[PDB]
Amino acid sequence: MSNQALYEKLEQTRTILSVKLAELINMTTIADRNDDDEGSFAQENSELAVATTSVMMVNNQTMQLIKNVQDLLILTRSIKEKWLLNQIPDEKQIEELLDNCIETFVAEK
Amino acid sequence: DDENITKLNKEIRAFDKLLNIPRRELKINLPLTEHKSPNLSLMLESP
Amino acid sequence: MVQQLSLFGSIGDDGYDLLISTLTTISGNPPLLYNSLCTVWKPNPSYDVENVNSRNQLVEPNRIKLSKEVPFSYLIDETMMDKPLNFRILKSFTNDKIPLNYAMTRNILWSLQISDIPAAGNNRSVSMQTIAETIILSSAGKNSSVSSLMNGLGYVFEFQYLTIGVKFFMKHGLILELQKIWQIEEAGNSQITSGGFLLKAYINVSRGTDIDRINYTETALMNLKKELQGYIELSVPDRQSMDSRVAHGNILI
Amino acid sequence: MQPPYIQERLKSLNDIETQLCSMLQEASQVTFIFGELKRGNESVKPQFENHVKQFYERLDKSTTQLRKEIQLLDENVGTNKKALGQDTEKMEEQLDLLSAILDPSKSK
Structure with missing residues (x-):
């Protein structure tokens, strides 16, 4: 129920943040990094598969952002629909009125 | 007791003069002497 | 004589108002106020009923219920005529005190009723009870009074109590009752159902032999119970609590 | 018309999706600006910080307000009926018509 929606929106927000950081780092270091030190870990071994992985990142971030927002x-x-639907929430004068009506009909009939 | 039943009873009873059976009565007094006055009462109904 | 098929429950007064609205959303009917007064009578211990067949147990002594309706003019104090006579008055009935006291009920002294312990076995989904009923219309004589009548039969007064609540009529003859019970003594009046309402949903069957009708009644009661899932839990009471024989003393309240 | 409480509830919800649309738009402008920032002109560099900060603050408080709404759902629980009076009101209006019929000076 509502708690499940809360949790779902929670992974929704954290996934937005994570994919945002991922696309940020991917596009910022999209310029490939060459460092002689062994500490750095950036490998571009096969030339065109690099561009394939790049368009991979593009398609992933597009699909995930659009799906999450939708x-x-x-x-x-x-x-809003749940809000709209589920929220469950003289005689005497008549006597002379009918008397005049019936006498008028009797006279007119 | 409850408001609803009395309300419905009042509203239904308000229409008695229309729903009830019509009736009529005619009393005829004939002028006679010797203090002997016969009466003729004719009541007309539609049961 | 009827076979009454019943289910029970209770609620706290806090949700009371809310509950009422939900019922009107389902039944489509408004609640109707009612009251009653029940007096329980037991066989006289001064008389030795040796006729109880001890070697065979053909019968055991039992308790008789006499009920009557009392006008609200005895239950409304000087502070309450301003409000109209509807269900909301129950919201003010939370105190153990009540306008009807011991002396007035003593001055009063109908429907006569006898019952039996529900049917045994653990394959029963609703409380099935047998009731034998008759009506007293009037009387006369030099000692025409309920007390004198029941002493003539051989019974004496034991206690009494007062029920006030609301009724809902649904389809198929199903009746749902919300009650508050006030025990009455010369010492005073005490509300046993303190801070809550007792809920009881029941149907009546005229002939116990007809089994198609009984199956239909059970189907309706279980459907009603499955409709109210999550709000109120309707349960079968204890079979040993609805036993009203003199030999053993307890009173479901 | 609906009771007011539902009215401000729907107003708050509408504000929520308008804020979401604004967040998407600002994502579009930040994606736009990062392109020329990668191109190599540093003039629009200061605008980048402002855009990022506004984007994040738009992303956060919108979700916060939606969380508040879902919380309101939690305590809002417990807080043909018209047919019960429907015939009655019909009754009333019919007699009113009779009055208009009964008085010939009001039929103008």
């Missing part, structure tokens, strides 16, 4: 919007609409 899911959040659908979640908001579902909440």
Whole structure:
């Protein structure tokens, strides 16, 4: 129920943050790094597969961002729909009125 | 007792003069002497 | 004589108002106020009933219930005529004190009723109880009074109590009751159902032999219980609590 | 019309998705600006910090407000009915019409 939606939005937000940081680092060091020291770990062994992995990153970040935003919007609409649907919430004068009506009909009939 | 039943009873009873059976009565007094006055009462109903 | 098929439960007064609304959302009917007064009578211990067939146990002594309706003019104090006579008045009935005291009930002294312990076995999903009922219309004579009548039969007064609550009529003859019970003595009045309402949903069957009707009644009761899942838990009470024979003393309240 | 509480609830929700749209738009501008920042002109460098900060603060408080709404759902629990009076109101209006029929001076 609502707690499950809370948790789902939680991984939604953390996934946004993580993929944001990932695309940031990927595009910033998209310029390949060559360092003589053994400490650095950046490998570009096969030339064109580097571009393939780059477009990999592009497609992944696009799909994930769009899907997460769309899911959040659908979640908001579902909440609003639940809001709309689920929230469960003289005689005497008539006497002379009918008397005049019936006498008028009797006279007119 | 409860408000709803009394409300419905009042509203339904308000229509008695229309729903009830019509009736009529006619009393005829004939002028006679010797203090002997017969009466003729005719009541008309539609059961 | 009826076979009454029943389910029980209880609620705290905090949710009371909310509960009422939900019921009207389901039944489509508004609640109706009611009250009653029950007096319990037991066989006279001064008389030795040797006729109880001890070697065969053909029968055991039992307790008789006499019920009557009492007008609200005895239950409304001087502070309450301003409000209309509807269900909301129950919200003010949380104190152990009540306008109807011992002297008025003594001045009063109907429907006569006898029952038996529910059917044995653990394959029963609803409380099935047998009830034998009759009605007293009037009386006369030099000592025309309920007390004198029941002493003539051979019974004496034991205690009494007062029920106030609301009723809901649903389809298929199902009746749902929300009650508050006040025990009454010369010492005073004490609300046993303190800070809550007792809930009871039941149906009546006229003939115990008809089994298609009984199956239908059980189906309706279990469907009603499965509708109220998550809000209130309706349960079968203890079979040994609804036993009203004189030999053993306990009272489901 | 609906009771007011639902009205400000729906207003808050509408604000929520408008904020989400603003977040997407700002993501578009930050993606745009990073391109020329990689190109090599440093003039728009100061704008980058502002855009990033506003993007993050738009991402956070929107989710916070939505969390508040879902929390409101938690305590809002417990807080044909019209048919029960529907015939009655119909009754009323019919007699009103009779009154208009009964008085010939009001039929103008």
